[PDB]
Design a protein around this ligand. Structure first.
Ligand SMILES: *[C@@](O)(C(=O)NCc1ccccc1)[C@H](C[C@@H]1CCNC1=O)NC(=O)[C@H](CC1CC1)n1cccc(NC(=O)OC(C)(C)C)c1=O
Length: 220
């Protein structure tokens, strides 16, 4: 039986909210955030990982376009193929496309595999958030209400299941019975609920939140 509510921030597995600025690197922030939690679970260390490393290095070979968009799954595969990702401290974020500067002397994490959850299944997503960790997801964020969100459970009647914005599910719960997914965004600490948005849960795959979920793992 799954818990009624989960918040990975209470478990020390979620880093500070980041600010992506004018570079379309949401997918890179989503991917590093998922891996940050697995790194904490394995090593006991909470460390921000380099989104810039993904922007600069998980590029054409991975179907990604840096500040013009990319995929969390192919980002994970880059980390696997590359045998590492650098710390954010050593490879900080510049909000621009750059030549790859990865150096293994600054490696902060590895990845052994990733898993893509089945399309649209919010119960399967709940189980993964409860039992595995934060899950990278795409959402349909192409509506003014998403930009204007301040607090509460977000519901947008015009939302679709075609996703365009990579974010991180770090928990779930309910606000006076209204069920939600707890989502970490990468638009800085002034967006929404100090960087987070609670999005409607069990409302027909609202905004496509369960369309394309994935999470990485790290070898023991
Ligand atoms: C992500 O949502 C993001 O960085 N948003 C903030 C932002 C938006 C615009 C400009 C600067 C910052 C990201 C935004 C994309 C990339 C730049 N412009 C955008 O609209 N979204 C993605 O990277 C997204 C991730 C998938 C899981 C949902 N994504 C990946 C790959 C391709 C596309 N879109 C795309 O190619 O659109 C067309 C119109 C076909 C060019 C995409 O959205």
């Amino acid at each position: 039986i799954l818990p009624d509510s989960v918040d990975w921030r209470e478990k020390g597995c979620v880093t500070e909210v980041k600010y992506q600025g004018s570079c379309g690197a949401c997918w890179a922030f989503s991917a590093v955030g998922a891996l940050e939690a697995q790194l904490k679970l394995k090593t006991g260390k909470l460390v921000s990982l380099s989104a810039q490393n993904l922007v600069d290095c998980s590029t054409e070979k991975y179907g990604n376009k840096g500040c013009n968009g990319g995929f969390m799954t192919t980002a994970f595969q880059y980390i696997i193929d590359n045998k590492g990702i650098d710390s954010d401290a050593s490879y900080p974020y510049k909000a621009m496309d750059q030549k790859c500067q990865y150096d293994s002397k600054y490696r902060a994490a590895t990845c052994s595999k990733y898993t893509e959850l089945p399309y649209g299944r919010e119960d399967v997503l709940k189980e993964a958030v409860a039992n595995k960790g934060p899950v990278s997801v795409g959402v349909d964020a192409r509506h003014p209400s998403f930009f204007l969100y301040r607090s509460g459970v977000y519901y947008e009647p015009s939302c679709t299941q075609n996703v365009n914005h990579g974010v991180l599910v770090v928990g779930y719960g309910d606000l006076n019975g209204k069920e939600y997914w707890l989502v970490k965004n990468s638009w800085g600490h002034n967006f929404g609920e100090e960087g987070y948005i609670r999005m409607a849960r069990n409302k027909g795959n609202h905004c496509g939140i369960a369309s394309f979920p994935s999470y990485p793992e790290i070898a023991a």
